[PDB]
Amino acid sequence: APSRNGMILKPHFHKDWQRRVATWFNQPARKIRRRKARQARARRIAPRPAAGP
Amino acid sequence: ACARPLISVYSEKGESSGKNVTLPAVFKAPIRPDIVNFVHTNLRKNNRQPYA
Amino acid sequence: GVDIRHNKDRKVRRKEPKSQDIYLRLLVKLYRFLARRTNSTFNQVVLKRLFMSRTNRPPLSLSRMIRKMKLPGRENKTAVVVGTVTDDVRVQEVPKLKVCALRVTSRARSRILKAGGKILTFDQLALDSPKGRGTVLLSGPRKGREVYRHFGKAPGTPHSHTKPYVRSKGRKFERARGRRASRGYKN
Amino acid sequence: PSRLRKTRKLRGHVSHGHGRIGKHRKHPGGRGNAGGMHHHRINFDKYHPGYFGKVGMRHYHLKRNQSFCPTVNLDKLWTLVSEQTRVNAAKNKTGAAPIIDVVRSGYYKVLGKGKLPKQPVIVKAKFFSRRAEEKIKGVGGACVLVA
Amino acid sequence: SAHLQWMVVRNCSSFLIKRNKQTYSTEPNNLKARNSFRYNGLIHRKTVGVEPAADGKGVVVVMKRRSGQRKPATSYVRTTINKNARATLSSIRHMIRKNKYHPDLRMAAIRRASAILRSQKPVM
Amino acid sequence: NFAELKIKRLRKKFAQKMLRKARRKLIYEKAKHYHKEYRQMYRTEIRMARMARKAGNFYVPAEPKLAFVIRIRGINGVSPKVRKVLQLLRLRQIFNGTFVKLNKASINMLRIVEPYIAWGYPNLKSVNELIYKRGYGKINKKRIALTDNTLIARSLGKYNIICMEDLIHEIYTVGKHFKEANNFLWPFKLSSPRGGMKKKTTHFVEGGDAGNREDQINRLIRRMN
RNA sequence: UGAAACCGUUAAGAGGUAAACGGGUGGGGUCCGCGCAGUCCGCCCGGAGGAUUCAACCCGGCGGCGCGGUCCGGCCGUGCCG
RNA sequence: CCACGCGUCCCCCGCGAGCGCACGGGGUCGGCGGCGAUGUCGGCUACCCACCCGACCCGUCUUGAAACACGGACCAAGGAGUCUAACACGUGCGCGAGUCGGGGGCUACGAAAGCCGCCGUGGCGCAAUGAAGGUGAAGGCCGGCGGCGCGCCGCCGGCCGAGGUGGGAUCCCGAGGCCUUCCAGUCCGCCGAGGGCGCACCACCGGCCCGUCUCGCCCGCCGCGCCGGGGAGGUGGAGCACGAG
RNA sequence: GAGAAAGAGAGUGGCGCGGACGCUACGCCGCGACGAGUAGGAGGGCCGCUGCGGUGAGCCUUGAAGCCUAGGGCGCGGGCCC
Ligand SMILES: [Mg+2]
Ligand SMILES: [Mg+2]
Ligand SMILES: [Mg+2]
Ligand SMILES: [Mg+2]
Ligand SMILES: [Mg+2]
Ligand SMILES: [Mg+2]
Ligand SMILES: [Mg+2]
Ligand SMILES: [Mg+2]
Ligand SMILES: [Mg+2]
Ligand SMILES: [Mg+2]
Ligand SMILES: [Mg+2]
Ligand SMILES: [Mg+2]
Ligand SMILES: [Mg+2]
Ligand SMILES: [Mg+2]
Ligand SMILES: [Mg+2]
Ligand SMILES: [Mg+2]
Ligand SMILES: [Mg+2]
Ligand SMILES: [Mg+2]
Ligand SMILES: [Mg+2]
Ligand SMILES: [Mg+2]
Ligand SMILES: [Mg+2]
Ligand SMILES: [Mg+2]
Ligand SMILES: [Mg+2]
Ligand SMILES: [Mg+2]
Ligand SMILES: [Mg+2]
Ligand SMILES: [Mg+2]
Ligand SMILES: [Mg+2]
Ligand SMILES: [Mg+2]
């Protein structure tokens, strides 16, 4: 039942979407994990270029 | 305003030293409690763990 | 019993700005005084335009500033918007201007002060001219927003050139039955 | 903030702002965009004309990178290059026109909308409008192509 | 300045208390102790305050000078008046009136000093 | 110095005091001239009736130029054509009164609202005592009671109506600026009638109170205020 | 901690249109006013008092400003120039 | 009789002093009297009782409920427009033809906060139109060269330059004038006949871009072709017409 | 506050040291007219509950939260203070 005026639109929520949802609360946990892994690699290859080849 | 006074530097004994630095222009920025309250509201919601 | 209707009995205007910043309300505290103790009707228009919304204070650009100043008669006259004097980049020459606005874009400030004009704000305008004597009041394009293209007589209706709300402009998105003589009907 | 929302004023009112005669039922007009040609045809033709039907040629594997050709107008042509070039072009008595590579700024095509100020140019582009190149000729200046 | 920091302080100050449909303000240099613009003592350049003395008797009068605005320790000057009730009030009247020092508070300070001295003369 | 600056203050004050005194003598003699005019207006319609009867003819007096309408039926259940005429007569509440000059454009309005109004030809005493007791003024579209002549004179000075008997003369002797003088007057909030109505619903001819009751509107006014 | 419905008992009051309710008072209670000879506050006059007492001066300190028309020295400019 | 003086020409027949009374811009007394320590005073309200008037039980669906309409014995606690996403508009805030780091990276509270700018990739916006190939948003003036039975320019040199009409808040000008004893007489302020430059917006007429149709002639060259460009007049567009996101 | 567009305007020539309240300008004050309401819409709550950042040199074993009350009260009212 559309009202007076507005976009008629297609939300893709007809599937069961609450079971498959990706919450990003580990975003700063990965932004700590990556830089810990990167510092460990940059210590491990000790004079070599830190970015790689 | 426009004027920048000359803010004295204090030694650890409490009394004033001869060092005397001018007041930076940050301390003449406009005072807006609206913008302060708005940014404090929306940023204190960011250190917040979920509950369900 | 009294035979009057009360439908429009409450008039609908603003009498204070809906904003809560303190500098705008100090400008309001100034022009409340300057509007009731002067006989200048400039101060009432400035007081009424300080109340208005962001959409009722559209930005007046610099190439319309200078264009409405290049009219005859209004030489060495200060000129006042209540909104925002933004820069316009499709203009090269800029005359000297005596602008008075609430907030001028930094690039427009550089552009005007390079040309040698000066930028007042409203607490300086009150000291320079309390009755607004020798000013040119201007305003931006109030129908300049794109939401005044979705308004008016509805689409799908003859002689109504209204932009409809379409989620993505293409050849598949509202081109087919109302829009063509071949398929359905044309309006 | 639910503290500011409508439901805090609608406590005690026994219909909660939806009526006693027509109750707030679940889906009275069908779900979604239902009934386009049947019982909401009046809405979809007073407010979304053209919504039903096919038109035009189907182009299967479309790639939005083949048809990349952004445009710039002549009144913002001089906004590509810094102010010192056009100031020195106005000061130069030689007639040395400044060279403006629009592709370096990121516009492939030059269209001509506005008044262009009267000092020469070498505008090099990937495409040109008819009116744009003749405005460049009318100010007196060259239209260099580049691939 | 003064009118910006009044519009900051006016509803957000720790000296403001609001209950029983009455609004007050507990800054130390306030005369009549009420939240207003004239009477608030933290804001202005020039400011009169009336306090009872550190001794049980006497009235100290606080004057904000004009120079050290941002310097709080050397901003307020104290003067102690341990005298009869008439000359205490004439001293406060001469300090506020004849120094041209913020003359709207000229009667409120005399009311406050008269209320301090009544409490300092002994209880019935 | 404050020597000549002092004395020119009371020079200007004495000047406007003498100006006010000249204005009071003006409106005194205007009221006297009005009393003379009303004596002549009352005696000449007796004089001419006598000189008609002395020959044996008849003297038809002039049809009056001034009626006073009163709304005697309430808000509820009003037909809309009857309603709009009452809104143009400014009879909104029950028991409001309004002076109305007569012509063909107005009598055919009054017969549309004949079931709801009682109107007749108000006497000089009626036009006096309505102004003095219940007469207010639409000043700055507010309702200010006519307590002093300046309230009349500031609004109606440009029509040369500057005391209260000027307003009474313009209403009664219906003048050139009757529209402005009457629309100055707020509609008269008359009380409910002492003694009591005869019958609200039927016309005055058939033993009621609605409709034209020509000379008899004064008996209604005397007990409605 | 120990509420409400419900119940026992004590006290008070009442009772033939089931009870209950709104407006209006009246009567009886129960507690409170810490009622139960009723306010103070300025200025003036008179009468008795008691002070280490006011005004004016002198010294010291502190503060404010017809602005010193224009005193000397600083610092700053979201001012300019060399 | 709300009529009071004198002096000057001619028609006609600008500050007097005091007191006082008040049907005068909303009430005062500069008038009084009683009763008060264990039996009395005040307490409108809240406890009980009495009387007169009034008085059907709530929720609900209904044209209409006290209904012989359904729900409800009573009480305590729990108990129903929430959250995510998209969109629309209105509002407040920052910046502004730009804007935004949301993804990544660098350095207890802090899983925050700061920072990047050769991390603006990217989104939205600054350009539309067409099914599509595509095209893609003012012009005007001068001089020369029945082209002659473009007085209308094909191409160049110079110049003006980015509409008009009506209404329009604001402003700008100012014929005159705002008195103190009178005349001349400057400065400041103010009022104002009349006249302008007209914001936003509205209405209308023009103009430009894209599609389409009709009419018609001219121009371009590396390829003179089933090539390319152009004009005039209608008409279709969610356009432009000195940003507004 | 005054029936009449506008200056309580500047210039040149003939003793006693005194004077209430105010103005949280989102404040205070002054006039006028008005007040019905279901479905619904909107505004204001110094109405109420729970938690969080600030703050009250807040309160509290010399007795907080809760609960009861024929006690004193305030607010139209939600409710609240003794
Ligand atoms: Mg609906
Ligand atoms: Mg009524
Ligand atoms: Mg109503
Ligand atoms: Mg309304
Ligand atoms: Mg309701
Ligand atoms: Mg609703
Ligand atoms: Mg229902
Ligand atoms: Mg429905
Ligand atoms: Mg139905
Ligand atoms: Mg629903
Ligand atoms: Mg069907
Ligand atoms: Mg009836
Ligand atoms: Mg009787
Ligand atoms: Mg137990
Ligand atoms: Mg018993
Ligand atoms: Mg009964
Ligand atoms: Mg039902
Ligand atoms: Mg049903
Ligand atoms: Mg039925
Ligand atoms: Mg119904
Ligand atoms: Mg039945
Ligand atoms: Mg049944
Ligand atoms: Mg049922
Ligand atoms: Mg049942
Ligand atoms: Mg909508
Ligand atoms: Mg908006
Ligand atoms: Mg997109
Ligand atoms: Mg109502």
Curated annotation (Swiss-Prot), chain D:
Hydroxylated on His-38 by MINA. The modification (3S)-3-hydroxyhistidine is found at H38. The keyword Ribosomal protein applies. It comes from the Eukaryota. Residues 1-36 are annotated as: Disordered. The keyword Chaperone does not apply. InterPro entries: Rbsml_uL15_N, Ribosomal_uL15, Ribosomal_uL15/eL18, Ribosomal_uL15/eL18_sf, Ribosomal_uL15_CS. One of its GO terms (biological process) is translation. GO terms for cellular component: cytosolic large ribosomal subunit. Transmembrane segments: none annotated. The modification Phosphoserine is found at S67. GO terms for molecular function: structural constituent of ribosome. Keywords: Acetylation, Cytoplasm, Hydroxylation, Phosphoprotein, Ribonucleoprotein, Ribosomal protein. It is found in: Cytoplasm. Component of the large ribosomal subunit. Component of the large ribosomal subunit. The ribosome is a large ribonucleoprotein complex responsible for the synthesis of proteins in the cell. This is Large ribosomal subunit protein uL15. It comes from Oryctolagus cuniculus (Rabbit). The gene is RPL27A.
UniProtKB/Swiss-Prot annotation, chain E:
The modification N-acetylserine is found at S1. The keyword Transmembrane does not apply. There is a cross-link at K57, K64 (Glycyl lysine isopeptide (Lys-Gly) (interchain with G-Cter in SUMO2)). GO terms for biological process: translation. InterPro entries: Ribosomal_eL28, Ribosomal_eL28/Mak16. Gene3D superfamilies: 3.30.390.110. Keywords: Acetylation, Cytoplasm, Isopeptide bond, Phosphoprotein, Ribonucleoprotein, Ribosomal protein, Ubl conjugation. It comes from the Eukaryota. Belongs to the eukaryotic ribosomal protein eL28 family. Component of the large ribosomal subunit. The ribosome is a large ribonucleoprotein complex responsible for the synthesis of proteins in the cell. This is Large ribosomal subunit protein eL28.
From Swiss-Prot, chain F:
One of its GO terms (molecular function) is structural constituent of ribosome. Component of the large ribosomal subunit. The ribosome is a large ribonucleoprotein complex responsible for the synthesis of proteins in the cell. Binds to G-rich structures in 28S rRNA and in mRNAs. Plays a regulatory role in the translation apparatus; inhibits cell-free translation of mRNAs. Keywords: Acetylation, Cytoplasm, Phosphoprotein, Repeat, Ribonucleoprotein, Ribosomal protein, RNA-binding. The modification Phosphotyrosine is found at Y116. The modification N6-succinyllysine is found at K104. InterPro entries: Ribo_uL30_ferredoxin-like_sf (IPR036919), Ribosomal_uL30 (IPR039699), Ribosomal_uL30_CS (IPR018038), Ribosomal_uL30_euk (IPR005998), Ribosomal_uL30_euk_arc (IPR035808), Ribosomal_uL30_ferredoxin-like (IPR016082), Ribosomal_uL30_N_euk (IPR012988). NCBIfam families: uL30_euk (TIGR01310). It comes from the Eukaryota. The modification N6-acetyllysine is found at K101. Component of the large ribosomal subunit. Homodimer. Interacts with DHX33. The keyword Acetylation applies. Belongs to the universal ribosomal protein uL30 family. Pfam families: Ribosomal_L30, Ribosomal_L30_N. This is Large ribosomal subunit protein uL30. GO terms for biological process: maturation of LSU-rRNA from tricistronic rRNA transcript (SSU-rRNA, 5.8S rRNA, LSU-rRNA). It comes from Oryctolagus cuniculus. GO terms for cellular component: cytosolic large ribosomal subunit. It is found in: Cytoplasm.
